[PDB]
Amino acid sequence: VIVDATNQILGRMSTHIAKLLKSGKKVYVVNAEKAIISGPRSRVLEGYSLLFTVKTMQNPYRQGIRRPRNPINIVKRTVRGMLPKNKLGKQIYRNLKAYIGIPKELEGKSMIRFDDADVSRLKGKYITVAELSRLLGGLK
Amino acid sequence: MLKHQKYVYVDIGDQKKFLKVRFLKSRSENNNPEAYVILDKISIKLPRNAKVIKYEDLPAEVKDKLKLKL
Amino acid sequence: PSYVKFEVPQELADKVLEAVKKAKDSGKIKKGTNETTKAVERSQAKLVVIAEDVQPEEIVAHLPLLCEEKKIPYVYVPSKKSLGEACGLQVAAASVALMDPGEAKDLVDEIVKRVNEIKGKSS
Amino acid sequence: YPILSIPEDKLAKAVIKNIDASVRDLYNVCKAIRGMNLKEAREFLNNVLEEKEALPFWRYSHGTSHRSNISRKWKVKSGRYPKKAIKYVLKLLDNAENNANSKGLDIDNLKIVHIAAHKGLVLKRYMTRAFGRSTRKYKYLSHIEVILGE
Amino acid sequence: KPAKKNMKSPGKAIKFLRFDWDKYYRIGRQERWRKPRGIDNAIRLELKGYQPKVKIGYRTDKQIRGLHPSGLRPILVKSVKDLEAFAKGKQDVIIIISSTIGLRKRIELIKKAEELGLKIANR
RNA sequence: GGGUCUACUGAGAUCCUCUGGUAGGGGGGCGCUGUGAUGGGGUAGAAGGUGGGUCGUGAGAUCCACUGGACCCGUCACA
RNA sequence: CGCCGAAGAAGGGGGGAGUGGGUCACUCGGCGUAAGGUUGGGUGGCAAAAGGGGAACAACCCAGACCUGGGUUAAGGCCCCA
RNA sequence: AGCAAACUAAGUACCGUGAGGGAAAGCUGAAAAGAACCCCGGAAGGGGGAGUGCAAAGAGCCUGAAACCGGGUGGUUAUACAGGGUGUGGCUCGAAAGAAGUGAACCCUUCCGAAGGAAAGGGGCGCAAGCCCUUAGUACGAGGAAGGGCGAUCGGGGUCACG
């Protein structure tokens, strides 16, 4: 089960992920950097910048620690912080994977979109995900 | 209570089930049937201070009423 | 002894039990009247043991005639409790039939023939 | 006298009474050699007698710290030398084979199948702290039983 | 008869142990029930999910109230004489031979029942 | 709770209805130990303990295996 | 008018009590600017009132728990947590 | 507990310069028959083995609970909670004492049916979101009845997973 988030609203796209999570089926996301958040540049950064403690970064993505700044970090906290707090909530969180671009071995499989998350549903003044890490600290 | 040896347990196949009756130290014989009154109490485990008897030890006359329960 | 038709001596009825004991180990035996009766209708039975102490009796009383009409041997046995334990059961069993003696070939047969003379003089 | 599984005529039982050995430290002893053969066990203790290697603790670890003499028994890193304790254990197992020799067995092929650790008997004395007070200075005894067999 | 089990199995009874039996052993071995007469106490306030305070409403049906689990009526015996006063007959009651009667008295005592067709549990 | 039947004094049938809970009042029930009795009974196979079935809303009752090794309950009334 | 009443009864007598530090919400006062302050009138809980919502909650709203089960509903809510 | 006092001495040991205050502590079985004798240690009524005796829980001696600790049985742990009841399970114990072969557990099939309560289709209306009559109090249904087929475990105890 694979979903594309290109030109999708992260908060909106987040939702139907969760029901698929609560379903009990393993999922994936590709090209996640291609989602967007409504809002002008100042706020959307400011509405995220407030959480900073320190700056640096010294591993491959795999940690999942108290402050996200990689492109596929931000998706996780937005999908994690929207999951049951009971024990299965942790366990269901184990079945999710994040990606930038397209993993090679998943190209030849179907993908689906969430129409409710289409950019067209929004007036405008949005920013792509990948743009964030440029300001958020992601060298990528 | 078994230490009085006023009871005797029966060994059948030495498996995980045991049978018990009341023995009579009187009657002075090995072939005496009346010194043995058959009951119906199969027991899971052999009791600690129990006194054990082998099925073949019984007088042949009394094997009849017993082997059926085996 | 309502459904009972002819008397069998103890020295004979008891001799069935060890065969029944020799039946359960390496043969097929049905326990349960609704099962054992079906053996007659399925004609899968060969030997039948009946306890002459049930209460009430009509649950077993109809077997002797229905088994007879298919010409299958059967016998009366003293105690269901004795039979029930002979079925490896902690509780008595009323009706039990023989599906196959297995290793009990040589002793089931003479029991069948040596009970007929009692029934032969019993009409 | 707990396990009665293997036929008795192949078992050796010997017990000891009210001996000064802090059961707090004895706990290692029963888990030390449980199931190991006597031979290597005897010198294993001797090895610890002259500190070739220490002996593991498992939880009563306060006071005793890491050596660099411990990896046989895996996760253990707490080593202390219980000579006053272990001396009895050697002394105890000595009384064992006498029984084994009594009944015609094979000394080398024997098995430590049960070793018993138990509270001993209590002796009552009173210490004397300051300020005209009194406290508790009981001397803790011990009982250790062992079961040997082939 | 078929309406015997159809309330006990669904109406699963509750052990009804003392309030706060779990925490302190000084209650568990007591293994009984008491009415908490407190103020800050919980079950007296009926807070959810706390093995709710006993009340009269959890009775068993009067048609079987206190029936023997086999459906008959449980009445005990202590000696030979009590047997003759068996009520009505063997059809509605079961007997518990004394927990303390001696065997040298039991052997004759037990025989008195089945000859009268009674039902005996502690055989 | 209130409106029909049997019983040397509690037991049944039917109808209506009422249903949170401290201070407090009232109704009824089990247990402990002794006394009188008591169709009565129970005991070298009791008591008790351990664990576990079954009854009872519960209060508790009651039972099975073992351990024990010499005395112990049911009913009524009474203290 | 309406309701309770001889199934379950206006008045009279009698046995036994605890209760005399309340608080808060709303509403109309006084004192004081004020106060989860104090001090009054009326109502309501709570005290001694579980159950659902308000995030958790004595008092805010819904609503008075003989028990089990089924169903429909209230105050509230209906993207996910749920 | 019974007066403090049932015991090898009780107003005794003892605390106090003093008038004074003031303890604790029963049970070997009937008969010591107190384990002769053989091995370890030096010894220990200590070990082991044998023996007495109904029984040795045989000197620390009737019976022998918990708090405790140790060995084992059964589950079970290093991504993670206090606990309990609760649903689903997994694995385990199940001799009797509970059901049960005179039928448990499990499948079907037929029937009755509380309140309550549908949908597709049809037609109409409303921008829409839907409603209106019909399909229909029908299918459905909490509960209860019959039959069949299957054939022996269930109920129950312990732990753990997650809700």
Query: Between vectors from CA C57 to CA C54 and to CA C60, what angle results, nearest 5°?
Result: 90
Burial call C67-89: b when 16+ CB within 10 Å, e when fewer: beeeebbbbbbeebbbbbbbbee
Q: Say how far A31 CA is from G35 C1', in Å.
A: 60
Long-range pairs for D51-58 at CB < 8 Å and ≥24 separation? Answer: D51/D81, D53/D79, D54/D79, D54/D80, D54/D81, D55/D28, D55/D79, D55/D80, D55/D81, D55/D82, D55/D86, D56/D28, D56/D32, D57/D25, D57/D28, D58/D27, D58/D28, D58/D31
Residue B59's CB is within 10 A of a number of other CB atoms, namely 13
Token pair recorded at residue E13: 């009874």
Scanning C25-99, the segments in alpha helix (DSSP H) are: 33-41, 58-61, 63-69, 80-86
Chains E and A touch (3+ CB pairs under 8 A): no
CB A20 within 8 A of CB A14: no
Strands E73-76 and E93-96: parallel
Measuring CA to CA, which residue among C44, C39, C47, C49 is closest to residue C8? C49
**Angular region, A64: left φ>0, alpha ψ -120 to 50, beta rest:** left
Q: Say how far B58 CA is from H55 C1', in Å.
A: 26
Q: Does B56 touch chain E (CB under 8 A)?
A: no
Q: Rounded to the nearest 5°, which phi and psi values hold at E28?
A: -55, -45
Measuring CA to CA, which residue among A75, A48, A44, A49 is closest to residue A61? A75
A136/A49 Cα distance (integer angstroms): 8
CB D146 within 8 A of CB D115: yes
Q: Resolution in angstroms, to 1 decimal, for this deposition?
A: 4.9
Q: Which of residues 9-68 of B touch C (CB under 8 A)?
A: 67-68
What are the beta bridge partners of residue B36?
B23
Scanning E13-72, the segments in alpha helix (DSSP H) are: 25-28
Give Cα A32 to chain centroid, integer Å. 6
In chain H, which nucleotides are within 7 Å of a protein Cβ? 39-41, 46-49, 54-56, 60, 66-72, 78-81, 83-87, 94-103, 105, 144-146, 149-152, 156, 161-163
Burial call D66-85: b when 16+ CB within 10 Å, e when fewer: ebeebeeeeebbbbbbbeeb
Token pair recorded at residue B10: 């029966």
CB D49 within 8 A of CB D69: no
Q: What is the Cα gyration radius of chain A? A: 15
Token pair recorded at residue C109: 């047969």
What are the beta bridge partners of residue D112?
D148
What are the beta bridge partners of residue D12?
D148
Give Cβ neighbours of residue A8 (< 8 Å, ≥ 6 apart).
A34, A35, A36, A113, A114, A117, A118, A119
D31/D8 Cα distance (integer angstroms): 23
Q: Say how far E56 CA is from G11 C1', in Å.
A: 39
Q: How far is B37 from chain E (nearest CA, A)?
A: 10
Long-range pairs for D19-22 at CB < 8 Å and ≥24 separation? Answer: D19/D88, D19/D120, D19/D141, D19/D142, D19/D143, D19/D144, D20/D84, D20/D139, D20/D141, D20/D142, D21/D82, D21/D84, D21/D85, D21/D88, D21/D142, D21/D144, D22/D85, D22/D140, D22/D142
In chain F, which nucleotides are within 7 Å of a protein Cβ? 19-22, 39-47, 50, 54-60, 62-69, 73
Query: Between vectors from CA C54 to CA C51 and to CA C55, what angle results, nearest 5°?
Result: 170
Beta-carbon-side half-sphere exposure of residue D73 (alpha carbons within 13 Å): 20
Q: Say how far E29 CA is from F29 C1', in Å.
A: 25
Q: After which residues is chain A broken (C to N over 2.5 A)?
A: none
Give Cα C98 to chain centroid, integer Å. 8
| Residue of chain E with shortest Cα separation from B41 | E123
The owner of tokens 């593991």 is D56
E92/B28 Cα distance (integer angstroms): 47
Measuring CA to CA, which residue among C55, C111, C110, C51 is closest to residue C81? C51
The owner of tokens 């199931």 is D35
D53/D80 Cα distance (integer angstroms): 9
Method of elucidation:
cryo-EM
CB D78 within 8 A of CB D66: yes
C17 contacts in chain B (CB < 8 Å) = 68
Number of H helices, E strands in chain B: 1, 5
**Cα dihedral angle (B42, B44, B45, B47), rounded to 10 degrees?**
-40
Token pair recorded at residue A28: 């994936």
What are the beta bridge partners of residue B18?
B11, B43
> SS3 breakdown of chain A: % helix, strand, coil, rounded to 5?
45, 10, 45
Q: Rounded to the nearest 5°, which phi and psi values hold at A31?
A: 55, 35
Residue C16's CB is within 10 A of a number of other CB atoms, namely 23
Mutate to test the interface with B, among C10, C11, C85, C91 (most CBs of B within 10 A): C85
Token pair recorded at residue E58: 């959890």
**Angular region, D12: left φ>0, alpha ψ -120 to 50, beta rest:** beta
CB E70 within 8 A of CB E90: no
Q: Does B69 touch chain C (CB under 8 A)?
A: yes
CB C39 within 8 A of CB C97: yes
What are the beta bridge partners of residue D79?
D56
